[PDB]
Design a protein around this ligand. Sequence first.
Ligand SMILES: Nc1ncnc2c1ncn2[C@@H]1O[C@H](CSCC[C@H](N)C(=O)O)[C@@H](O)[C@H]1O
Ligand SMILES: Nc1ncnc2c1ncn2[C@@H]1O[C@H](CSCC[C@H](N)C(=O)O)[C@@H](O)[C@H]1O
Ligand SMILES: [Cl-]
Lengths: 278, 286
Amino acid sequence: VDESYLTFGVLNEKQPGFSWLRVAYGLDPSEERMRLLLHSQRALRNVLLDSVDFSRAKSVWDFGCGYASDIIALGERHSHLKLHGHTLSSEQAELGLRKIEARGLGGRVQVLRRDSSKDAPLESAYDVILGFEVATHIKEKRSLFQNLSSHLREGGFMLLADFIANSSYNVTPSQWVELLSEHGLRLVECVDVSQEVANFLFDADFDANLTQLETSVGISAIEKRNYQAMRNFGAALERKILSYVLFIAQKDSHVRSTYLRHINQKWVEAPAPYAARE
Amino acid sequence: ESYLTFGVLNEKQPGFSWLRVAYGLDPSEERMRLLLHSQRALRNVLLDSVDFSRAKSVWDFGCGYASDIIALGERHSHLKLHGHTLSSEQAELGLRKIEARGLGGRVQVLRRDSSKDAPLESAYDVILGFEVATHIKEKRSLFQNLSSHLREGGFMLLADFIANSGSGVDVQDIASYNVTPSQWVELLSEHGLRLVECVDVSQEVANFLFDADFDANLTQLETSVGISAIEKRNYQAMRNFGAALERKILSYVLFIAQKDSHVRSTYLRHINQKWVEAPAPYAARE
Ligand SMILES: Nc1ncnc2c1ncn2[C@@H]1O[C@H](CSCC[C@H](N)C(=O)O)[C@@H](O)[C@H]1O
Ligand SMILES: Nc1ncnc2c1ncn2[C@@H]1O[C@H](CSCC[C@H](N)C(=O)O)[C@@H](O)[C@H]1O
Ligand SMILES: [Cl-]
């Protein structure tokens, strides 16, 4: 089961019989529920990717790329792009290589075993940097954002999907403003998808389905634990303890540091609700 | 003349008369201080967005008597600043003001039509337009000329007007050709201009312009001082413009935009529509 089937998605309403886990693992045979799973996951990614004219981009850096599904998809869609992914796992980089070669993308899509908090990437200035739920797993956040912003083209896009702590490593609204502002990163938009991700994750039969999943399919103690966290994460979004937010930012060395903090505060504290889009 | 620009007051000030204070009929030093502070506060909404130490060239595409670019030139000694004006005599007066301050090298005023004529430089870091586009009918010609001479990532800073009703398309003398929210979205997006922010200062300018005794004050100005029919006409137009803001037939909006050739055109329209339809209230500012 490709990692992309196990990502978050956005659902506008909870669907009474929907279980993301049963559908992703093919345990639910409903063709409509499968198309809903895939659509919701594509819709979440699209909030970020629809901002970028990739026909005018040359290079993309995913600084926590997993099994490289996102850069593989972009590389298949835009044949001219060079895409570089970072992972901390030597084996995960090997699995990503295998997927990349099997799709003929080996010439321009790479996965490197590099620590994005401290290891420079291949290119001096990327057009787009992607991070789907990576920054919250990284302790040295200023070291990370220094490395990211140093290797981002002026005017280049940084596209993040990450969490805000409203009260692993949780980041408060005021901390996000400073992390972005200190590194010359100007938000174009924040989009709050908290409730819609909570809707996607809500599974009234979750514990039953997770057990049923573990006898039918084979899932490791690691995988089981990871899915338990996703369920708990949905509950935290429901309770508004956390927010799940999409950040569309650009490198901007020409805005004043006080004005940069003004406009980043506007978007971090008053993100656009997802339900008001087209 | 610069004492006759608009300012922002957060609430109506009883006994404050922009006309009495500007001319000196009111000898209050505190009120004179308020008048200048309010006019600076309006400019600063736009000017505070730009790190001018990292800018090299500024284009004021409708510069009046060059007051704005002279001030910027004296604050930032490295800046080149170019102003455009339609008349012949305004340029001459501006250049004399410029030369009287030793700014002749760096600051220039040209008689050029900004809707059609190319500026001196091919790519400015900042383009300024304080109530200029409202006097320019050929909006697409103008914005093509502005954007094609703006650096990638450069700032365009406009003080201008959104028409909210049919009556607000033309407010006599002060705001001649105002366009609707949807027309603003198209004018900006078609030319690769992305809003960072819109700031609505309508009510605070109406507060600045409010004078319950304007008529009596205007007659005193004619009695004590000498003003021409063209001056008298402009001052009544400013009073009536303040009333029009109170009726909300138009909005006085500050636009902070950047040239952005890399954002998708559908997304560019989304984020420009957000700011034109939901501008930040000036009052929410700290
Ligand atoms: N400091 C760091 N440098 C590089 N990669 C990191 C990292 N910290 C976490 N990661 C990577 O982030 C990934 C998991 S975080 C979430 C998964 C990822 N968004 C995806 O789409 O698959 C893993 O590949 C992990 O190696
Ligand atoms: N098409 C055009 N090209 C260049 N300047 C123009 C213009 N249309 C109007 N202007 C200029 O805009 C100015 C009037 S609008 C006045 C506002 C000006 N920013 C100021 O502070 O004084 C005049 O100088 C006029 O010549
Ligand atoms: Cl004109």
